[PDB]
């Protein structure tokens, strides 16, 4: 222990920042978020300070550092580019026993500012003694990804409720198991954040009526197309809380590596009815169920079918969208789905029968899902229905993954090019495909 | 934020604890480890306070509270079981502008003491503000299984190298590139943990020897439609490490709160497009890691292509992190799947604002078995209704408008196609128009809110 972390209550307390440039602006922003009664003293100010001053948010004192400005101070920050001024600030603060930070000199004064993860009233702070700002930031990034955005809502609502939980639960063992379920109920958190009382109270005494061991729900989570970094923050959080993860072939190994160590896994890679009942069966055993699907759940994912099974049974559900194959393949192949006036619309199409005259019309970007089989037919029909034979085409196999393959050419070679790839692959047809020679940044295989 | 966390240097600074029971003993142990010059003022003391004052580790003042004991103090802790005494302490500390903790009353006084995870010199502090003692410990447990124990040795070694890093790398940019390699070298971490000095030195000399890439970079990052939970892990990594973030009005405040606190930020909401291109170009040429943070997905009606197409000729590295486009986010959060069973053979993402005297291909857009999603089409909703009808879309085709989709302020209105124009007057931008049979599924699949 070389530093003692404390969480200061600054609301309406006088604090002083010396300095008026970009560094001081960042510290002022932070102290204002904490409700400090802030004075800023500097020889000159960048315009953000005059804005705040004109909105009554702080006081400005233009001129040399005046150590009487510390007279009723609780905290001081020296944020100038002048070592001599910063040392004058820290000496004047030290003689008054005012905790003081010198931004460019962590061992020069009496406190250092840690990296902060804010879920107020819940807060986390990280500091390596000031000798590793990159390390503290790498930890902040991990923590920001793991703490749900609305955790603070549930933290505050916990107090509004501590009495009722003591009278329905006698032992401290059951009370702890109640808090465990309460704080990971992200649905209650989101309902609190939405200010939706009908949803809030519907979730609340469902927590008091259900037995403590029951936590039955289904979350559909979009895994994205392959790259584990394309999972959403909320997707990661949900798969870290699942009792049971139901997945298939199109969820990548990298994503599955993120699944919490002791979750049960069920591989359904199998008619849809079997899958719908698996989710129902697992949810009615009272378990927190995540159905992980490749890409986005509601784009040729049959996610709607999985959810109507559950609405029937009174099982709570939610959906976390994911990066669909079109978006992932577009970004990683350097083929934007729109560009300038090239396309008035993007068409996401599955390979009843397709309306070929419609697909052939000009000023579209066509994106075929599950169309490898019909790729010879697609070429033949588009040409017969008037698409210019020189229309650029591309096929992206295993888009966003470390084995992504991109082959490209013109419409007359589509059935040719399709044999060079296997599923999962996308076919993109449109003038945007010509941009790849300028926008290609990801390694090809 | 409720509180500002700070990490205080207490070495040789006077602190006062009032009270002498088990609570006071726990706080005194903490202050003593931090190097505080400690006085403890109490009517009675439990035995542990006798062992400490025998070894000269603190000063005991046996008796009622003496507020003059605060006169030279930097921190005060009120740890009696007498609320009247605790409040006299906190009043006396407040008059002296001394940060003061009242252990049994976290909402009183002026600082709270967090739970600590110790990987010294690395430290992680957690508190819920006293609103919930339980949540802190549940979080504390998770964070300990997350932070390897040898993280302290990595941090310790970094502190030792800091002078040499500062001497050999003249700019903050070069130093940052070194540290980013240092802190993810798993072999160095293992050698430190094993006290293998030859292996430490071999990897260290190689790290110092590596030529650094002084080129900047432009990364286009899809922020998603608003809910900060819908940023990708890679997009969070990019904004947590950017030098400068160029962003616009359709990037939500919650996502902006995830940006590196130290990054410069340039707002280009209403800046013309060719000037955005120049900002990214010149900032990357200056060697900075630039993030262009865009609403939704960068390559769907986001002009991301225009922002990139100068860069390869300029020899400036770039990449793209895709994001959740408005269609996908609004779909999920409104209960309206974009595809379902035989309802749609395709999803059409259409712009409702055209350049020139441009006309959409209404005959093509009116076809059956599709879900139409119009972006920036609010001003055109009356025209969209009339044209779709005139080219034969059924008059009772369901429609929906999602305003601020995925945000806590999201609003959804719905009806049939002959109501589209009037429905659009009920929302404001940003809003998506969804046209198609899948809109009827909302009453079954809507989970997010009814506002
Ligand atoms: N990584 C990937 N690269 C290219 N195409 C992919 C892909 N992952 C899925 N696909 C496409 O998606 C089809 C499965 S249908 C499932 C689509 C998914 N819900 C999504 O939103 O993307 C595959 O046949 C293939 O055409
Ligand atoms: N949160 C949101 N809710 C509803 N519509 C949104 C939205 N965010 C963006 N939009 C739509 O997107 C249009 C801007 S065009 C930029 C779209 C972005 N690249 C994307 O992929 O989503 C807006 O006019 C509005 O129609």
Residue numbers in the entry:
A (entry chain B): 1 to 269, 277 to 358, 364 to 457
B (entry chain A): 1 to 270, 277 to 457
Question: What does the primary publication say about this deposited structure?
Answer:
Siroheme is the modified isobacteriochlorin tetrapyrrole used by siroheme-dependent sulfite and nitrite reductases (SiR/NiRs) in catalyzing the six-electron reduction of sulfite to sulfide or nitrite to ammonia. CysG is encoded by a gene fusion between a C-terminal SUMT (CysGA) and an N-terminal bifunctional dehydrogenase/ferrochelatase (CysGB). The C-terminal enzyme module, CysGA, is homologous to a well-studied class of SAM-dependent uro’gen III methyltransferases (SUMTs) that catalyzes the methylations to generate precorrin-210,13.
P1331Cβ sits 3.3 Å below the plane formed by the sirohydrochlorin isobacteriochlorin core, forming a hydrophobic platform for the macrocycle. The bulkier histidine projects into the active site, positioned in place of the pyrrole nitrogens when the tetrapyrrole binds, so would also disrupt tetrapyrrole binding and release.
